[PDB]
Structure 1
């Protein structure tokens, strides 16, 4: 009985609340964001999905799977920085 929330939706959720700006913030006005506190975001994700051993290593692997899906891409040469391929298009399905 966990949250049916998706990982990219969960990130979008954190990005909506100022309370989480210290751990994840927007770095552009076109979908780019940065995991300021990557392990903290990962622990939060594990609590949500009920995976106590969740860490940034495995969360990042999930993000890498989004490259193929064209949901999220990596911002090359910028640690912890990623970009939503089509934000906010992904919010008006």
Structure 2
């Protein structure tokens, strides 16, 4: 079972106990790694990569640009946005998930 990066992020983004380092911005599917190092750290443990960091992690994200899985919110640091049909994948709309997560 090899989880992919974009799926790891979704996993973090739907667990309240993770809002400290990663969270939805309240605008659709846009999200922010408030503490990229902690995200990278956890991404590193899951994949067994002791030397993982936000630099390498984000190169992973950049490869999603053409795959249109995740796009970059230009100008906002550590801010990206899922551009794929997450409403169909998760079954929730951004509002519903935000409400359910207590996103502010």
TM-score (norm 2): 0.81
Unaligned regions of 5+ residues in structure 1, if any? Answer: none
**Corresponding position of 1:22:** 20
Q: Secondary structure at the match of 2:64?
A: helix
TM-score (norm 1): 0.90
Query: How far 1:28 sits from its partner (Å)?
Result: 2.5
Q: 1:65 to 1:6 in 2, by over 3 A?
A: same
Structure showing greater radius of gyration is 2
Unaligned regions of 5+ residues in structure 2, if any? Answer: 91-104
- Cα distance in 2, alignment partners of residues 40 and 29 from structure 1: 23
**Corresponding position of 1:78:** 76
Equivalenced residues, count: 90
Q: CA RMSD in A?
A: 1.4
Show structure 1 runs of 4+ deviating over 3 A: none
